[PDB]
């Protein structure tokens, strides 16, 4: 029989990406035939709880995915290999999310990239707007704003009147300008970062601050006063509403991430493209998130783990994760396979990546986060419906969100 290979295990939570890794590792083992890599797919819902007990019990895989909201505890407690290499070919946003105490604690694998603005070029042309104009847009609570008049021109009622025109009837809107809504990823986290505010800090909700107040007041205005985005009752409990209106030819600008590329490309019958995120008072600040693979410091085969991590961080190894156009390599030299997948389909994905070259805001998360996000949602729904006031809602919602998180964490300790 042939020689026994050293077996390295890799843990993750995403089924299609697990399938791409299996392809990547088959290629690794052809050139490194002394090592066999096995993937271990564990469901996301219990991933971090099960990792914590496996690592504590000395039964964790050799390599495992981490997110920004959970890596620190592992790094601080010596559970992770230091990643000792230059980071120049790795997405900086992802490197930054796994750097602690001056050390990088995982090999960047995937990025969400940034948020951008899908546009219906036929509706822009109908309004006399060139697609290039959508890259010049600025939102502001002050007189320097240019987003609001653009959105008003792109919002039209059944009689053909735009949102800026006397006699416009918001009850009879047939086409919206935009998708402002109670939507953290596509909308409000970007508005908060673009106003210099935070959403989460040190594991707690922290969105009751001046930057966030400005962001939410602007969004409440777009929806309830300008009528350039759908009423909040259409979007508060219905995360696909705006994408569905965009696909139906009823929305000019649709701000979203690369997660909307596949459904838009599959169904849109009109001419469409992607433009930059609008700049706010602190600049164009997008939400982003990344995933890195950490090496288990307790591995029985550390040299093999280091070889497998070098492969995973390489052009060839990481290209496998992007070649179906469904996930974005964090290795910069591997990103062309994702760009080329999309450009073959007529989509230039540049704006999702260009926005990362600036200030950013992290996607929030962490232990007990889901409980707190669930708690704030009814308060945010009323705010986006134009009821009460932004300041009093944010105060109350933050207290409710933190209380729900803390209960969940207390229940876990006991």
Residue numbers in the entry: 34 to 447
The paper states:
Phases were determined by single-wavelength anomalous diffraction data to 2.6 Å, exploiting the anomalous signal from bound iodine ions. The structural model was refined against a native dataset (apo tetragonal) to a resolution of 1.5 Å. The UspCNt structure determined represents the ligand-free form and the model comprises residues 34–441, plus six additional residues of the partially ordered C-terminal affinity tag. The tetragonal crystal form (space group P41) contained one copy of UspCNt in the crystallographic asymmetric unit (ASU), whereas the monoclinic crystal form (space group P21) contained two copies. The subdomains are joined by a central flexible hinge-linker that is localized around residues Asp145, Thr321 and Gly379.
UspC from Mtb is a 441-amino acid protein that has been previously identified in bioinformatics analyses as a putative active importer of carbohydrates across the inner-membrane of the Mtb cell wall. The uspC gene forms part of a putative three-gene operon, uspABC, of which uspA and uspB encode the membrane-spanning subunits of the transporter, while uspC is a homologue of ABC transporter-linked solute-binding proteins. The fold of UspCNt follows the architecture of periplasmic binding proteins for bacterial ABC transporters, consisting of two subdomains or lobes that enclose the putative carbohydrate-binding cleft in the centre of the molecule. In conclusion, our data strongly indicate that Mtb-UspC is a carbohydrate-binding unit of the essential UspABC transporter system, with a substrate preference for sugars containing an amino group at the C2 or C3 position.
